[PDB]
Paper text:
The CRL2 E3 ligase consists of a Cullin 2 (CUL2) scaffold in association with a catalytic RING-box protein (RBX1), with the substrate adaptors Elongin B (ELOB) and C (ELOC) at its N-terminal. When associated with the von Hippel–Lindau (VHL) tumour suppressor substrate receptor, the CRL2 complex is the primary regulator of the Hypoxia Inducible Factor 1-α (HIF-1α) transcription factor. Activation of CRL2, in common with other members of the CRL family, involves a cascade of E1, E2 and E3 enzymes, which conjugate the ubiquitin-like protein NEDD8 (N8) to residue K689 on the CUL2 scaffold. CSN5 is responsible for the deneddylase activity of the CSN.
Using 3D classification, we were able to generate maps of three different structures: (a) a holocomplex map at 8.2 Å, (b) a map of the complex with little or no density for VHL at 8.0 Å, and (c) a map of the complex with little or no density for CSN5/CSN6/VHL at 6.5 Å. The two partial complexes likely arise from compositional heterogeneity in the original samples from which the structural analysis has succeeded in isolating subpopulations. In line with subpopulation observations from our cryo-EM, we identified subcomplexes of the CSN–CRL2~N8 missing the CSN5, VHL, ELOB or ELOC subunits. In our map of the CSN–CRL2~N8, the Cullin arm was observed to shift downwards away from CSN3 in maps deficient of the VHL substrate receptor, consistent with the coupling of VHL binding to a conformational change in the rest of the CRL2 portion of the protein. This type of behaviour may allow the CRL2 to adapt to individual substrates and substrate receptors which vary in size and geometry as has been suggested with the CRL4A system. In addition, it may reflect changes associated with remodelling of the CRL2 by the dissociation of the VHL and the binding of alternative substrate receptors. An interface between CSN1–ELOB can also be seen in the partial structures of CSN–CRL2~N8 missing VHL and CSN5/CSN6.
Numbering used by the authors:
A (entry chain G): 1 to 215
B (entry chain N): 1, 100 to 176
C (entry chain E): 24 to 283, 296 to 333
D (entry chain O): 672 to 745
E (entry chain D): 272 to 406
F (entry chain F): 29 to 207, 215 to 316
The structure:
């Protein structure tokens, strides 16, 4: 319905009315069709509904595990936690791989190939850059293949998930560093209001001296 | 402008302009374009089958009131 | 009021227009009240003019002891700096404009000469000194409104001079500025022939409070553009032309001070320091952006 | 009559074409008609060819803007 | 980037003189498709070798670099090479280029979120406006 | 209130800032002529850069009162442009500014009036008689679509900046301050940065509220902040590191030569006065 970065736009009121009316096993079908929603793998205001709250910790408590994985966890979590979460499709298993990998490139300028080969259990170049190119092909990834650094060049990242909340701490760390660079640059500003304002005064007075030298 | 000459397009558009008896047709071009949007560099000023130098005075070619400063000029301006 | 000077009293303005104080003293006009239309298309049409010299009619008025430039700008033309009375040919512009400008209450009339020497000024050269002198004996109050486009590019300040040239018979009195300026070979001789036949007007600027608020708010989102210049890449070649020109000027300062254009060595030291300052401040802004955005470490 | 009129016209035509660049196709040919009202009745078509003749000599070029409405060159 | 029997059905769309095909056996449209294919790969990618990109394209690395040099025997190619190291290269566009890339990248990203919330919080738009007038 | 909520056009022109001042100046002109804040018209032009609009240059016009409506005296404006298109050919009539409250059917009407010289023109609204803290410029543009069986145009707003001309910027810096030239330079930096600073600070404020309380919990808030913190210092790369060694070494040896220029001019004057008093120059 609404439109910015998100999965298939049906999903919002789609799963609103689904969890509203589909519950238990109908809630499981709800979840199964939730599973393919990439840009919203996390449902903060969609788990706002008590229907998803019973989705969570109901029969599908493992699915709330998976949802928080999207919010918090990674696919390599599943590589360890192969049984904790609900089932996933190979497409969706690679989707959780893309979870952790978009989070990684979110971290670094460019994540190494071997990094995701190992954490995401990726064996070889072929499948590696297959899922890589499909991630970039989602257009989440700008930049290019950082082969020489054995990385992936990254110029732009679309938001992966809703990623339940460091939100407060996130925005306040943002406020912190914003103000920090601001104050660095503002100390510069007033050093400028010193120096070549001092340059104005200095040369003005020096020229006064030179003019008074005559008579 | 003391000299009130005519700048004429290929179709005969003779324009009344105030210039001087030493007024540069270099700036007479400026005048024709500042007056008619038709810019002067395809307002090729030709005098009697032979071009008028874009860098000259109108009166250099004994140009006067009913004299003609050729455009060949453009249509989109007009 | 801040709008008290934007008031174009066509009564008062055209009154002092017909006042002819210059025929009593050709040094009456000491001020030049300007609205920023001069700066507007003077600047961006000397720059958009590339290197093509231009000419025409300025909007304006007169106030007290003040010429007033409501307008000055360029053409998409050439030939100025060498035309026999260039400017005239663009007056057709406000041969029409001002006329039905009165239809909107722009009851102003024509006052001056818009122009630009793209890259090397806005003035009247040797043949245009014929222009300037003849026309000030033709058209006084007349001005040599002088600002250089590429000088105002690598300079950061608008050296505006309203140069009412000293008419034939009227010599520079106590106040003749006569802004000496480095001229190409075409007109430097005739500038030496006529460098001291003009004075400058005290060119002030007038506006509204809305004008100031608009410029501040301009900056208030242009600062992002400020940190996105990349102009060291822009005219590094311009710096190179200055390289050659400066080694040349030191050659000529050499040739002057050899045995015996005044003291080309000192003038050359001056201009060298100047242009180096120019390139250095360009590098300043660029290193500014660089160190800022490149010292942002995660 | 046909060869001497054609020669007289080539010169009158190039000279116009240098003076003002019309230059259009259609309007141009019409204006050409206007200049030589006295001479004789020309072909409305061949208007095309007319400009064509001047296109070759490096006298006037063909602009991008229209099949008509070209530009003057040289 | 679609593959062989992903559109071998397009064989049915083709024409007999066209379904009569080329010397190397990649038909006229096949290699056309490879121009198309690799062009996608090309416009995409930074730098790759030819055992890499040939196994990618299921084809000889010989052919890969070979007909690369042919792909520029068109002159529709842009990039550069090492024959010996057997590599082609993306470019990192690195600099001032990438600088303003993500400069105005963040500009649009920030203004996207700004006006998203200004429309989701036009009331809070007014409130933030109030506090910023205080600012 | 017949407006139509649409999309972009064909804007790109060049700018100088006193024509913004001539937005001011037409309002002052018609106001002094009528003794009242006059809802005026003015010939908007601007930059069009990809998907960005920049509504910049618009001076005095003719705004007649047709019984309630602002009116571009259309053929009057035709006269006017031919009165300046001779020499102002570097600028094209993008739209019209005015002065009043929000956009009204008279503003819609003269915007349509601007929609008759071209197909998709722009709309600007200024007012010194309105009551905002922002730079008073509203900017509208057009789609053509089908709704409720009616085929209609569509006019909606997009955001701008202002010109980037060198001497223009210098004049902006002065006429803002009107007194130190990079100071007269960096204050354009300061102004734009403070403007977007208010922007992303309002962002910061309603953001902080999100995590605080009573303000909507969305997952698309900070998330972008994560993107930002991975947008940190671009090009660590050593590429630009060498590049900037290059740049600063160039300018610095330039300055070194200028240590040359300065002290050599000093030296020549010294040799002069040495040839002045020690010698017969
Ligand atoms: Zn002259």
């Amino acid at each position: 319905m609404a439109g910015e970065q998100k999965p298939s736009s049906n999903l919002l009121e789609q799963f609103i009315l689904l969890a509203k009316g589909t519950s238990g096993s109908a809630l499981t079908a709800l979840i199964s069709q939730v599973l393919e929603a990439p840009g919203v793998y996390v449902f903060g205001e969609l788990l706002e509904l008590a229907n998803v709250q019973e989705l969570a910790e109901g029969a599908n408590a493992a699915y709330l595990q998976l949802l928080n994985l999207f919010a918090y966890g990674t696919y390599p979590d599943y590589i360890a936690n192969k049984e904790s979460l609900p089932e996933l499709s190979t497409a969706q298993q690679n989707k959780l791989k893309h979870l952790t990998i978009v989070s990684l490139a979110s971290r670094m300028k460019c994540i190494p190939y071997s990094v995701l080969l190992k954490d995401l259990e990726m064996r070889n170049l072929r499948e590696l850059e297959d899922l890589i190119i499909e991630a970039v092909y989602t257009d989440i990834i700008q930049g290019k293949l950082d082969q020489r650094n054995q990385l992936l060049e990254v110029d732009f990242c679309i938001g992966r998930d809703i990623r339940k909340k460091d939100l407060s701490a996130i925005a306040r760390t943002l406020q912190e560093w914003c103000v920090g660079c601001e104050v660095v640059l503002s100390g510069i500003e007033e050093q400028v209001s010193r120096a070549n304002q001092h340059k104005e005064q200095q040369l003005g007075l020096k020229q006064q001296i030179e003019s008074e030298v005559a008579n | 402008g003391s000299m009130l000459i005519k700048v004429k397009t290929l179709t005969g558009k003779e324009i009344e302009i105030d210039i001087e008896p030493t007024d540069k047709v270099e700036r007479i071009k400026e005048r024709v374009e500042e007056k008619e949007g038709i810019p002067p560099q395809q307002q090729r000023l030709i005098y009697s089958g032979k071009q008028m130098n874009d860098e000259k005075t109108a009166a250099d070619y004994k140009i006067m009131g009913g004299s003609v400063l050729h455009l060949v000029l453009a249509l989109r301006g007009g | 009021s801040i709008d008290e000077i934007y008031k174009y009293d066509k009564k008062q303005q055209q009154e002092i227009l017909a006042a002819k104080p210059w025929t009593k003293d050709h040094h009456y006009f000491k001020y030049c009240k300007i609205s920023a239309l001069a700066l507007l298309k003077m600047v961006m049409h000397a720059r958009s003019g590339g290197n093509l010299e231009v000419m025409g009619l300025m909007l304006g008025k007169v106030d007290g002891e003040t010429m007033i430039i409501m307008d000055s700008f360029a053409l998409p033309v050439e030939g100025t700096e060498t035309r026999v009375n260039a400017q005239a040919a663009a007056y057709e512009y406000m041969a029409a404009y001002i006329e039905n400008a009165k239809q909107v209450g722009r009851l102003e009339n024509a006052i001056g000469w818009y122009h630009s020497h793209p890259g090397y000024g806005c003035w009247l050269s040797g043949i245009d000194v014929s222009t300037q002198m003849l026309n000030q004996q033709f058209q006084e109050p007349f001005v040599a409104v002088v600002i250089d486009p590429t000088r105002t590019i690598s300079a950061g300040k608008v050296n505006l001079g309203a140069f009412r040239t000293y008419p034939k018979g009227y010599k520079p009195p106590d106040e003749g500025p006569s802004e000496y300026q480095t001229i190409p070979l075409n007109k430097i001789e005739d500038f030496g022939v006529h460098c001291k036949q003009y004075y400058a007007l005290e060119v002030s600027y007038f506006k509204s409070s809305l004008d100031r608020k608009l410029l501040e708010l301009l900056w208030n989102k242009y600062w992002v553009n400020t940190l996105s210049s990349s102009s060291l890449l822009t005219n590094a070649d311009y710096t190179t032309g200055q390289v050659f020109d400066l080694s040349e000027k030191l050659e000529q300062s050499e040739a002057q001070l050899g045995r015996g254009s005044e003291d080309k060595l000192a003038k050359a030291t001056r201009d060298s320091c100047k242009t180096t300052i120019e390139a250095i401040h360009g590098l300043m802004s660029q290193v500014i952006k660089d160190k800022l955005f490149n010292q942002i470490n995660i | 009559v046909d060869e001497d009129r054609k020669m007289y016209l080539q010169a009158a035509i190039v000279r116009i074409m240098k003076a003002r660049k019309v230059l259009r196709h259609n309007a141009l040919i019409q204006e050409v008609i206007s200049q030589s009202r006295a001479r004789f009745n020309p072909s409305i078509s061949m208007i095309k060819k007319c400009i064509e003749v001047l296109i070759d000599k490096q006298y006037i070029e063909r602009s991008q803007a229209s099949a008509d409405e070209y530009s003057y060159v040289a | 980037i679609i593959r062989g029997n992903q559109l071998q059905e397009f064989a049915a769309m083709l024409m007999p003189h066209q379904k009569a095909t080329t010397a190397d056996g990649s038909s006229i449209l096949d290699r056309a498709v490879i121009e198309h294919n690799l062009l996608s790969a090309s416009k995409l990618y930074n730098n790759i070798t030819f055992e890499e990109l040939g196994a990618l394209l299921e084809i000889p690395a010989a052919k890969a670099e070979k007909i690369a040099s042919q792909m520029i025997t068109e002159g529709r190619m842009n990039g550069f090479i090492d024959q010996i190291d057997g590599i082609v290269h993306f470019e990192t566009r690195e600099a001032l280029p990438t600088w303003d890339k993500q400069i105005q990248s963040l500009c649009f990203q920030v203004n996207n979120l700004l006006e998203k919330i200004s429309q989701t919080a036009p009331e809070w738009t007014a409130q933030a406006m109030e506090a910023q007038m205080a600012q | 209130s017949v407006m139509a909520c649409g999309v972009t056009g064909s804007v790109s022109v060049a700018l100088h800032p006193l024509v913004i001042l001539n937005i001011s100046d037409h309002w002052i002109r018609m106001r002094s002529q009528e003794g009242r804040p006059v809802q005026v018209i003015g010939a908007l032009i601007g930059k069009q850069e990809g998907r960005n609009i920049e509504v910049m240059n618009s001076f005095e016009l003719l705004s007649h009162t047709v019984e309630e409506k602002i009116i571009i005296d259309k053929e009057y404006y035709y006269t006017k442009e031919e009165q300046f298109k001779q020499v102002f050919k570097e600028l094209e009539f993008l739209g019209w500014y005015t002065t009043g409250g929000p956009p009204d059917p008279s503003d819609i009407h003269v915007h349509k009036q601007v929609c008759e010289i071209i197909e998709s023109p722009l709309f600007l609204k200024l007012n010194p008689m309105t009551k905002h803290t922002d730079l008073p410029v509203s900017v509208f543009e057009s789609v053509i679509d089908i709704i409720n069986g009616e085929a209609t145009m569509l006019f909606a707003e997009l955001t701008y900046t202002l010109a980037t001309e060198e001497a223009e910027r210098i004049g902006v810096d002065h006429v803002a301050r009107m007194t130190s030239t990079v100071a007269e330079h960096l204050i354009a930096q300061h102004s734009a940065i403070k403007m977007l600073h208010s922007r992303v600070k309002l962002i910061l404020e309603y953001v902080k509220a999100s995590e605080a309380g009573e303000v909507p919990f969305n997952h698309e808030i900070l998330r972008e902040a994560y993107a930002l913190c991975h947008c940190l210092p671009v090009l660590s790369t050593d590429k630009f590191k060498t590049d900037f060694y290059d740049q600063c070494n160039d300018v610095g040896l330039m300055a070194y030569l200028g240590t040359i220029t300065k002290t050599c001019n000093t030296m020549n004057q010294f040799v002069n006065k040495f040839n002045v008093l020690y010698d017969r120059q």
